[PDB]
Motif scaffolding. Structure first.
Motif, PDB file in Angstrom:
ATOM      1  N   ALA A 186       0.825  -1.206   0.000  1.00  0.00           N
ATOM      2  CA  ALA A 186       0.000   0.000   0.000  1.00  0.00           C
ATOM      3  C   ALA A 186       0.864   1.262   0.000  1.00  0.00           C
ATOM      4  O   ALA A 186       0.605   2.198  -0.768  1.00  0.00           O
ATOM      5  N   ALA A 215      -4.232   1.260  -2.932  1.00  0.00           N
ATOM      6  CA  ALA A 215      -5.002   0.089  -2.533  1.00  0.00           C
ATOM      7  C   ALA A 215      -4.969  -1.011  -3.591  1.00  0.00           C
ATOM      8  O   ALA A 215      -4.990  -2.199  -3.242  1.00  0.00           O
ATOM      9  N   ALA A 274      -1.832  -3.165  -3.275  1.00  0.00           N
ATOM     10  CA  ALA A 274      -1.840  -4.051  -2.122  1.00  0.00           C
ATOM     11  C   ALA A 274      -2.805  -5.223  -2.282  1.00  0.00           C
ATOM     12  O   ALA A 274      -2.448  -6.355  -1.957  1.00  0.00           O
ATOM     13  N   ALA A 299      -5.782  -1.104   3.599  1.00  0.00           N
ATOM     14  CA  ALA A 299      -4.888  -0.533   2.589  1.00  0.00           C
ATOM     15  C   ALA A 299      -5.390   0.817   2.086  1.00  0.00           C
ATOM     16  O   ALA A 299      -4.584   1.682   1.720  1.00  0.00           O
ATOM     17  N   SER A 340      -3.098   4.042   2.502  1.00  0.00           N
ATOM     18  CA  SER A 340      -2.746   4.899   1.371  1.00  0.00           C
ATOM     19  C   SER A 340      -3.109   6.346   1.660  1.00  0.00           C
ATOM     20  O   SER A 340      -2.352   7.268   1.333  1.00  0.00           O
ATOM     21  N   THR A 384      -1.121   0.844   8.339  1.00  0.00           N
ATOM     22  CA  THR A 384      -1.727  -0.311   7.666  1.00  0.00           C
ATOM     23  C   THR A 384      -1.602  -1.564   8.522  1.00  0.00           C
ATOM     24  O   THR A 384      -2.571  -2.320   8.687  1.00  0.00           O
TER      25      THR A 384
END
Lengths: 203, 203, 203
Positions: free
Chosen positions: B101, B123, B126, B153, B157, B181
Motif C-alpha cells: 500500500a 489500494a 496491495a 490498505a 494509502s 496499515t
C-alpha cells in the motif's frame, strides 16, 4: 455546453444499478461501493488505457468518482426505496449508455480516425463497466448472453464516427450519436429485442 | 535504506498464499505458479498501467519475479509444511499489505498530487493481486465479501497522502503509512472486523 | 516476407475455437463474436498495454479484427460443419500458438533486452486471449488446469530470446521460435503431456 447533465445522470444511474447488483450478491459495503464505482467508471478507465491516456480521467477528475461513491453509498443506506424504482432506472441507464458511447467514441476518434477503434472503444466506455461488474460477481457478463445493450452502443459509436467523417461538428456529432443510442435502447427494452442464438439439441 | 526487507517478505508471503489457493483449487504446477505470481505482483502491474509506467517493474526488475516464482515453486514442492503455518503467514501477509500500500501510494503520488488517485492506486497495489487470483479461481473476490484487507490498505494509502501533503519527508511517509496499515490489519484479524451487509429477507 | 500466412491461420483458428466455446456456452451472436475476437486478438491487446504500445495493433490494423469477426461470424452461421473438424483445428491452433508466441516475444524484445519480460509477454500474446475467453465464460482458465499450451509458448518465447541474444537475425529467430513451439505443442497433444498436480486426500 452542459452535456455534463447526461454524463452525471449516467454515473448516478450506473452506480445505483451496480450497487443494487452488489447487494443482491451479498457483498459487504466495500463491494457494493466497488461494484457501483466499476459499473459507472470502469468503461472509461479501460478506454483510457487502450488509448494511452494516463492517468485515467475517472481516477483524476474529482466529481466523477465522488458522484459514483455517493450514489453507491446512497443505494446502500436507502436500498428499500431505490430497488422499487424499476422503470425510471432503466431509462436513466439508457441515458448513461448514450452519453458514455458518445464520449468514448469522441475520445477514440481524437486518437485515430479509424472506424474499428472508434466503434469498439466507444462501446467499451458504455458497457465495459458492466462487464467488470459481472466478472467481479462471478457471472457470465450480461452482454454476451441477452438483451441489446452493447449492440446499441456499437451502433451509436458508429453513428458518431460517420458524422465526424462527414465533417459534422463535434458537439452536433455527440448529440446525434447520443440520441440514436437512446432510441435503439428504448425500442430494445420495450420490444424485448434480442440477438439470435444457436439452438443445439443435446444427445 | 533497506525497506526491501518488508517488500521481499510481502512478495514471499503473497506468493505462498496465492500458491496455496491454487493447490486447493486443483491447479497444475503452472497454475500454482501463475496464482502465486499474480497474488504478489499483479497489484503492481495494474498500477503501472493505470499510471502509464511501462514496462511494469514486476516484469522487468529480475529479483521480484524470481522471488515470486521460487516462493510459489517452494510452496508446491513442500506443500505439507507450508499449509500448517497459519498464524505466521497471516502476519507476513499483513507486512506485505503495508509495504505494498505504501509503495503504490508513493508511485501514484509522484504522478499526481491527487487524493483519489493515490488512495485507489495504493489500494490496488496491495489487494489488486488477490483480486486477480480470485477471478482466475472463478470466485467472487474476497475483498468484496468479507474481512478487512482493502479497507486497511485504503486507510494506509490515505495516511501516506496526508503525510506527503503536510510536507513529511518521503521515507518517513512510507514508514508511518506502512505501520498504520499494519496496526489496522492486526486489529481486524484478531477482533474479526467486518464491514456491514444488507440483510434482505427473501420471499 | 510472408509470415502473415501463419498469423492469419492463427487468427482464423483461434476465432473459430473461441466462437465454438461461446456457442456451447449459450451466448448470443454478440457473445460468440466477442469470444472469438478475444481468443484471437486479446493476447496481443494485453501485450501492447504491458509494453506501452498505444493504440493496440489488433484494434487499429483493419485486416486483423476483420478476419477475426468474419471467422467468428462464419463459425456461427455454419456451426454444423465447423464443430466436427476436430483434429485439423487442433493443428491450426498449434500454428497460431507458434506464430503468436514468436510475434509477441519479438515485440517485447524490441522494448527491453530482458528474458523475463520477453518470455512472459510472448506467452501472454499466445495464450492471453484464451484466458480472457475463459474468464468471460465464468470458468477457471484452461491453462491453469490441464494440457500443455502455455508451457509450450513459454519455451517458444525463451527460444526466441536466446536466438536474438546470440545475434541470430530476426526473421530466422522468428521461424525457429515458431517451429519449436509447434514441435512441443504436437508432442503434447499426441502424448497427452501434463504438468504435475498435488494430490491431497480430503478428510
Amino acid at each position: 455546453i452542459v452535456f455534463d447533465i447526461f454524463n452525471y445522470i449516467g454515473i448516478v444511474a450506473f452506480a445505483i444499478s451496480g450497487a443494487i447488483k452488489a447487494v443482491k450478491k451479498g457483498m459487504d459495503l466495500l463491494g457494493v461501493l466497488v461494484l457501483g464505482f466499476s459499473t459507472a467508471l470502469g468503461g472509461g478507465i479501460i478506454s483510457n488505457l487502450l488509448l494511452g491516456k494516463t492517468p485515467p480521467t475517472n481516477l483524476i477528475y474529482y466529481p466523477y468518482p465522488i458522484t459514483a461513491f455517493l450514489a453507491s453509498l446512497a443505494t446502500f443506506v436507502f436500498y428499500r426505496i431505490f430497488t422499487n424504482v424499476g422503470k425510471p432506472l432503466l431509462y436513466a441507464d439508457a441515458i448513461g449508455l448514450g452519453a458514455f458511447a458518445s464520449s468514448g467514441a469522441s475520445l477514440a476518434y481524437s486518437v485515430s480516425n479509424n472506424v474499428i477503434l472508434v466503434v469498439i472503444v466507444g462501446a467499451i466506455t458504455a458497457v465495459g463497466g458492466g462487464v467488470i461488474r459481472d466478472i467481479l460477481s462471478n457471472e457470465v457478463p450480461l452482454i454476451l448472453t441477452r438483451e441489446f445493450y452493447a449492440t446499441t452502443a456499437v451502433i451509436g459509436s458508429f453513428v458518431y464516427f460517420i458524422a465526424s467523417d462527414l465533417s459534422v461538428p463535434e458537439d452536433v456529432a455527440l448529440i446525434v450519436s447520443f440520441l440514436i443510442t437512446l432510441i435503439l435502447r428504448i425500442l430494445a427494452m420495450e420490444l424485448k429485442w434480442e440477438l439470435p442464438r444457436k439452438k443445439i439439441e443435446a444427445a
